[PDB]
Write a protein that binds this ligand. Structure first.
Ligand SMILES: *[C@@H]1O[C@H](CO)[C@@H](O[C@@H]2O[C@H](CO)[C@@H](O[C@@H]3O[C@H](CO[C@H]4O[C@H](CO[C@H]5O[C@H](CO)[C@@H](O)[C@H](O)[C@@H]5O[C@H]5O[C@H](CO)[C@@H](O)[C@H](O)[C@@H]5O)[C@@H](O)[C@H](O[C@H]5O[C@H](CO)[C@@H](O)[C@H](O)[C@@H]5O)[C@@H]4O)[C@@H](O)[C@H](O[C@H]4O[C@H](CO)[C@@H](O)[C@H](O)[C@@H]4O)[C@@H]3O)[C@H](O)[C@H]2NC(C)=O)[C@H](O)[C@H]1NC(C)=O
Ligand SMILES: *[C@@H]1O[C@H](CO)[C@@H](O[C@@H]2O[C@H](CO)[C@@H](O[C@@H]3O[C@H](CO[C@H]4O[C@H](CO)[C@@H](O)[C@H](O)[C@@H]4O)[C@@H](O)[C@H](O[C@H]4O[C@H](CO)[C@@H](O)[C@H](O)[C@@H]4O)[C@@H]3O)[C@H](O)[C@H]2NC(C)=O)[C@H](O)[C@H]1NC(C)=O
Ligand SMILES: *[C@@H]1O[C@H](CO)[C@@H](O[C@@H]2O[C@H](CO)[C@@H](O[C@@H]3O[C@H](CO[C@H]4O[C@H](CO)[C@@H](O)[C@H](O)[C@@H]4O)[C@@H](O)[C@H](O[C@H]4O[C@H](CO)[C@@H](O)[C@H](O)[C@@H]4O)[C@@H]3O)[C@H](O)[C@H]2NC(C)=O)[C@H](O)[C@H]1NC(C)=O
Ligand SMILES: *[C@@H]1O[C@H](CO)[C@@H](O[C@@H]2O[C@H](CO)[C@@H](O[C@@H]3O[C@H](CO[C@H]4O[C@H](CO)[C@@H](O)[C@H](O)[C@@H]4O)[C@@H](O)[C@H](O[C@H]4O[C@H](CO)[C@@H](O)[C@H](O)[C@@H]4O)[C@@H]3O)[C@H](O)[C@H]2NC(C)=O)[C@H](O)[C@H]1NC(C)=O
Ligand SMILES: *[C@@H]1O[C@H](CO)[C@@H](O[C@@H]2O[C@H](CO)[C@@H](O)[C@H](O)[C@H]2NC(C)=O)[C@H](O)[C@H]1NC(C)=O
Ligand SMILES: *[C@@H]1O[C@H](CO)[C@@H](O[C@@H]2O[C@H](CO)[C@@H](O)[C@H](O)[C@H]2NC(C)=O)[C@H](O)[C@H]1NC(C)=O
Ligand SMILES: *[C@@H]1O[C@H](CO)[C@@H](O[C@@H]2O[C@H](CO)[C@@H](O)[C@H](O)[C@H]2NC(C)=O)[C@H](O)[C@H]1NC(C)=O
Ligand SMILES: *[C@@H]1O[C@H](CO)[C@@H](O)[C@H](O)[C@H]1NC(C)=O
Ligand SMILES: *[C@@H]1O[C@H](CO)[C@@H](O)[C@H](O)[C@H]1NC(C)=O
Ligand SMILES: *[C@@H]1O[C@H](CO)[C@@H](O)[C@H](O)[C@H]1NC(C)=O
Ligand SMILES: *[C@@H]1O[C@H](CO)[C@@H](O)[C@H](O)[C@H]1NC(C)=O
Ligand SMILES: *[C@@H]1O[C@H](CO)[C@@H](O)[C@H](O)[C@H]1NC(C)=O
Ligand SMILES: *[C@@H]1O[C@H](CO)[C@@H](O)[C@H](O)[C@H]1NC(C)=O
Lengths: 307, 77, 118, 77, 307, 77, 307
């Protein structure tokens, strides 16, 4: 049996051969929106993952959030103390894979220092503030004792501690905030240690400041111990982020979230996974078709078309 | 039907992967990630091409044999 | 200055084995391949072999296959050519010469022997 | 016989490879190693599936043709 | 010809089709033991590779060992001075690939320092000891001269030097062991250099100590030179490990070594390599079948089964 | 003709890739690069082998069928 | 139809079967020369990429060069101040991918220091010299002010700044060149910073010196700002390298460049890309056949050979 018009497919021994009926195997178009089911999507409005992690004021809505996919918009910006994350990609990757911002406040005993330091560049409410998940320790009175504190991990989940080192701009500011001429920070565990020597130097003017914060992280495995030993320039943690394992991930996309059902999410939106191959994007999340370079692949579903 | 169920059992379900878009220039690690992704894409594109070609070839061979057989039998009857 | 300094004169007996050494100076030995060329007294030059420093792959003339071995001691920037089963016909002057290509190509196919030992 | 000797020439002999099990969480490099291993495993699983399918198809086609030919010839004799 | 019972295989155009005889292509079971031939297996009892490398006392049996596969048991532990290896994975990988612990003692001329320093946390025999392949240099009398020593590599094989930096816990201990307030270590070659600034700070209590050792390595190529320049906190090497190239590797497995013949070793034991694909483990050593995700793959070895 | 145009569309055009030859010994990253390159080479060697085998099989089957058909028709005439 | 002699090919079901005519699919031989068209080849005689980048005297011919493939000969050597590049591979890779050495000299205002410092190990002309693309700042008179300079990136292309830190051999030389006992260098941008503490120590004698230069790079994106803050041991940049994107790359090969046409370049020379697979080398540039391990693959181009 034959049909009037036919579709041209390609075989081992033929560039083009006409057949009665042929289907497409490459999903090359996207709906343009991200379905919010079944995957727990978290739309990050104006907030990058690290900003919500640290506790940027305009990100206070993201506290204790959880997600199956964190969509990070291109309009996101930082509006707090100018910070800098050495190995930013690794921290972002592991935080995103953990899949929760659940922050447990721990009781740290800082003796002889002024806690809750703040700045005018990070304005919380009407007054000066700081990152909600960090604690800026400054000299109390006229001394800055060598802080030496510890926290044991007695639970059976990893703990993620986010701390930082404050690089001042001028030596006067260094000695005004921390009486030592050049302090250092050392966060260590049983298996590894990490020491930072803060430097003093002017930096490009960002949000009214020349000083910076360097953000580091330390993962305390179960049964391990954290020891923080510093004599200046320490941005102490306030607690720990509960690390996890799961199917969580992060994605950079400006697609709007929509109320629908779909399993495969690309930055171009949710796409159906009926077809085995897709050409939309090479970044995928969920049960997605395999990305291919071709924009069309015709599978013959009928007999050779001889009309 | 779909006919690819036997060859590709299902759409495998991947959740967390490497970065495939980079803003700045890092060096060794960024080049390694780009190379890995490009290698994977080329291999899967080739696999898709060959699979489609094989399925088309076998489908047309089978249908052609059936058409020819039925023509011969109907002509003989 | 690029210099190649060879061993002293050797006096042997037929059937024995000799080892001629070539000490390079002024450059790194692994940057250049090293050819070995003999000259019987008043008989013109005769190409003996070629050692590719940096990968150790050799190439000898069929006339010398098996009875000539070239090695490179990279620590001292030295290269050794040993001849086993010496004959009377092997009395000659031996020169080590520097050839350019070591990576990608066999050097002596396309490059000359710009620097020679004594 | 084994019939796979022609397609897979032998079992290639690998001695030193990357780490495929990790205790702690490192970040970029660990994710890259995991991604590389997963990519390799998926590609080889697909190759194995397709190879088995092709060998089965050709074996059954050949044996079916031989059975049919012998039946016709014996019936004619 | 037909048979009573048949095996169901899968083709291009059939999910399940019965055939007379069908073979398996996936090796999904392991004998559970590691054959000790032909590959030179080294069973590491209670010793990690790095511990045997450094010369941990309870690892003294591993001196000058060679292997084709180092099996590293999960019961291994360290019972010496608490150390820490930055880039631990790289050092372990290259040591394992070298395939020999052959250690050549070199004559180092340390003038004005007390060699063979030891500690009670690393008890060799009845008394205090240290790693057998390291030399703890402390102040002699009341001074610590700026050590500046050298060793040329005149052989045509790579040399591997393992050295370390001692981080003390307290400034008093720093000045008691090394008169300089804050020394440093610098190990350099013609092509590269490496400098470490030891820090002073309390660390999690491990085996009775708060101080640490940071273990670094330096590879001296043939014709190169090593220069060690330090003014404190130096754990000098005693010699060099003869680097090599070969088919050596390392594996983490608790399988017991057994007397038999097999070419393919996985952490689950030795497996036969007759079948082309295997499903046991993705970590392999030797001529091993390619790992696949499927647990069964039936190859038809007969005609279609019409009974 | 070449007959591989359909399966391999063209020679893909690669410009900047990872290092595939190393002088010294680095460790993790060098091992990762070596592993990635070896994986790619093994997969492409297998793909080439299988593609050649399939093309040869189909070519010989087709030519054999044509030869047999022409022999039968000429004999009948 | 049949032929006297035939070629043995391999199929799914046959190890060897003879056929009338068979073609080869693996290109296993190379012409031995590199065709200089259409790809813009740059033969680097005695110059490594980094040496031409820094401005080594015997590499002054490579200034403002551009290439589509930089061929780096095995005979290349350095004949200037002994330098050292941490993360050498990354810098070389990104410079090679940029594809141009186009250097734009910028006006840097170094106040209170002596510019154009030079050395006898790097002899330019008859007298002492230095790298042409670096500026060795030494003390002027008897002081060394804390240099704090800036350059904004107002253009819409990346800028690549190459700077360096000078490690002296002896403390006397340190205080003779830079009055501070131990200075430091800090090059920072809006998004990242990089600080180096120069060390003082003798190093292996290379080209008559024990001191070294550590070469670092900083990429200033459009709209960003560079701030250089140092108080000693600074090898300042003179300008910036115009970064780009393109099909540029680098290759290590001693093959001689030749006048011909070819698209695929391997270290063994230019090879034709008519065949789909090649066995020459696994390092390729351009539209190259895919590397395979097999040295021969016969494609049947005729009927079964029954003579
Ligand atoms: C296209 O160009 C490429 C580039 O040149 C050509 O590639 C070369 O091809 C030749 C010939 O095919 C190869 O030589 C053959 O090698 C085998 C065994 O080789 C094994 O070792 C090789 C060298 O290892 C040394 O060098 C490397 C790199 O420098 C170093 O890392 C090693 O550690 C080792 O170093 C030792 O030697 C140094 C120099 O003396 C010392 O300084 C040092 O201290 C050490 O002592 C190695 O390259 C090779 O293959 C590896 O690398 C390739 C990639 O190139 C990769 O594919 C492999 O998987 C390996 O990873 C092996 O490991 C040797 O046995 C052969 O000898 C034959 O001939 C002699 C006499 O002629 C007989 O006595 C033998 O019995 C045997 O028949 C032969 O020498 C060469 O190795 C290869 N690579 C290089 C970098 O040169 C390619 O051939 C060209 N193709 C065409 C078509 O033109
Ligand atoms: C080391 O060297 C660096 C680089 O040269 C110096 O850094 C500069 O420091 C000065 C002051 O210390 C900074 O000047 C300030 O710039 C701010 C940003 O201005 C930019 O953006 C505005 C729009 O927001 C534009 O209009 C403007 O043209 C710039 O493009 C200004 O907002 C600041 O203004 C405040 O102070 C002035 C002072 O008169 C008042 O008039 C204003 O009303 C306001 O209160 C000020 O102008 C400069 O930005 C810094 N540059 C960089 C790149 O960081 C270091 O100071 C120097 N340190 C030492 C110790 O030498
Ligand atoms: C900076 O801050 C850190 C953290 O707070 C301090 O580190 C602690 O230092 C103290 C002493 O300096 C350590 O105390 C010692 O702990 C040892 C380990 O005990 C653990 O394990 C045993 C079983 O093995 C358990 O029973 C016990 O509960 C612990 O879980 C003990 O073995 C030591 O005992 C010895 O000393 C005591 C002193 O009275 C004697 O009674 C004993 O008989 C024995 O001789 C001792 O108790 C403590 O472990 C350290 N903690 C960590 C996390 O390292 C630093 O001291 C501090 N430094 C400064 C300068 O402030
Ligand atoms: C810390 O420790 C290191 C290592 O021990 C010392 O470094 C050595 O320093 C000395 C001098 O300070 C260096 O000696 C010089 O070596 C040069 C290189 O010589 C080599 O190469 C030549 C061929 O080019 C060979 O002939 C020679 O045998 C060597 O293999 C020589 O060229 C120098 O000669 C100059 O000075 C001498 C001095 O008498 C004159 O006679 C000569 O005519 C010429 O002017 C000189 O010999 C030695 O090379 C360094 N070694 C290394 C490995 O770097 C540090 O000095 C030391 N520092 C401190 C503070 O203690
Ligand atoms: C070719 O086959 C496709 C696949 O079934 C047919 O598309 C379906 O057609 C039916 C008509 O009864 C619809 O109900 C389905 O929704 C269609 N599915 C899709 C995915 O399109 C198509 O009609 C066939 N064409 C011809 C000419 O036979
Ligand atoms: C199906 O084929 C397999 C493969 O040969 C047969 O298994 C072999 O059978 C012989 C019997 O003579 C034994 O000696 C071998 O040891 C068997 N080998 C293996 C790997 O099992 C099997 O007998 C065949 N089955 C049928 C029903 O014909
Ligand atoms: C087998 O086929 C090849 C491919 O065409 C033939 O090689 C060509 O032969 C023609 C002769 O007319 C030459 O002009 C071409 O230059 C050849 N091309 C190549 C790439 O070699 C070959 O002659 C055929 N052999 C037989 C016996 O038929
Ligand atoms: C169907 O056939 C008509 C002519 O009969 C032709 O114009 C058309 O392009 C064919 N395809 C479709 C989708 O209409
Ligand atoms: C977040 O959760 C923790 C425990 O799950 C709780 O202690 C804390 O108060 C919560 N914070 C907010 C803002 O809800
Ligand atoms: C063989 O056939 C019997 C029935 O004839 C059936 O019960 C059995 O499952 C088949 N397979 C085996 C392995 O016995
Ligand atoms: C190890 O071997 C080296 C040389 O191969 C030798 O000098 C040394 O004494 C040996 N050590 C032991 C414990 O056998
Ligand atoms: C062609 O056939 C001859 C004998 O007829 C045989 O000797 C030869 O090897 C065959 N091949 C070639 C390339 O000559
Ligand atoms: C290199 O090019 C820049 C601008 O393209 C120019 O200012 C500079 O003088 C050139 N240098 C040389 C040596 O030609």
């Amino acid at each position: 049996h034959a049909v009037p018009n036919g579709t041209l497919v390609k075989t081992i021994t033929d560039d083009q051969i006409e057949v009665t009926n042929a289907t497409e195997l490459v999903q090359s178009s996207s709906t343009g929106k991200i379905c919010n089911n079944p995957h727990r999507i978290l739309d990050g409005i104006d907030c990058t993952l690290i900003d919500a992690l640290l506790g940027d004021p305009h990100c206070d809505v993201f506290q204790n959030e959880t997600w199956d996919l964190f969509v990070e918009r291109s309009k996101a910006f930082s509006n707090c103390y100018p910070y800098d994350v050495p190995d930013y990609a690794s921290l972002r990757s592991l935080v995103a894979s953990s899949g929760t911002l659940e922050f447990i406040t721990e009781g740290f005993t800082w003796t002889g220092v002024t806690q809750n330091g703040g700045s005018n560049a990070c304005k919380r409410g009407p007054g000066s503030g700081f990152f909600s998940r960090l604690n800026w320790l400054t000299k109390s009175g006229s001394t800055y004792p060598v802080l030496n504190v510890t926290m044991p991990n007695n639970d059976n989940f990893d703990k993620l501690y986010i701390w930082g080192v404050h690089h001042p701009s001028t030596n006067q500011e260094q000695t005004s905030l921390y009486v030592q001429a050049s302090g250092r920070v050392t966060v260590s565990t049983r298996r590894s240690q990490q020491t930072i020597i803060p430097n003093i130097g002017s930096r490009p003017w960002v949000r009214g400041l020349s000083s910076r914060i360097s953000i580091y992280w330390t993962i305390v495995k179960p049964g391990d111990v954290l020891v923080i030993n510093s004599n200046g320039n320490l941005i102490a943690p306030r607690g720990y982020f509960k690390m996890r394992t799961g199917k969580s991930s992060i994605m950079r996309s400006d697609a709007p979230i929509d109320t629908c059902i779909s399993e495969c999410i690309t930055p171009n939106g949710s796409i159906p996974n009926d077809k085995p191959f897709q050409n939309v994007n090479k970044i995928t999340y969920g049960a997605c078709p395999k990305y291919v370079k071709q924009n069309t692949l015709k599978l013959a579903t009928g007999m050779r078309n001889v009309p | 039907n779909g006919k690819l169920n036997r060859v590709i059992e299902k759409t495998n379900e991947k959740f967390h992967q490497i970065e495939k878009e980079f803003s700045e220039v890092e060096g060794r690690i960024q080049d390694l990630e780009k190379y890995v992704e490009d290698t994977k894409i080329d291999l899967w594109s080739y696999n898709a091409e060959l699979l489609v070609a094989l399925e088309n070839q076998h489908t047309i061979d089978l249908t052609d044999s059936e058409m020819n057989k039925l023509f011969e039998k109907t002509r003989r009857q | 200055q690029v210099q190649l300094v060879q061993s002293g004169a050797e006096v042997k007996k037929p059937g024995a084995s000799v080892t001629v050494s070539c000490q390079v100076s002024g450059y790194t030995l692994t940057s250049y391949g090293l050819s070995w060329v003999r000259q019987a007294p008043g008989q013109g030059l005769e190409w003996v072999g070629w050692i590719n420093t940096y990968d150790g792959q050799t190439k000898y003339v069929k006339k010398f296959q098996g009875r000539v071995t070239m090695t490179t001691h990279t620590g001292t920037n030295t290269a050794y050519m040993e001849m086993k089963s010496l004959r009377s016909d092997d009395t000659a002057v031996y020169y080590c010469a520097r050839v350019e290509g070591v990576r990608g190509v066999m050097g002596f196919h396309y490059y000359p022997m710009d620097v020679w030992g004594q």
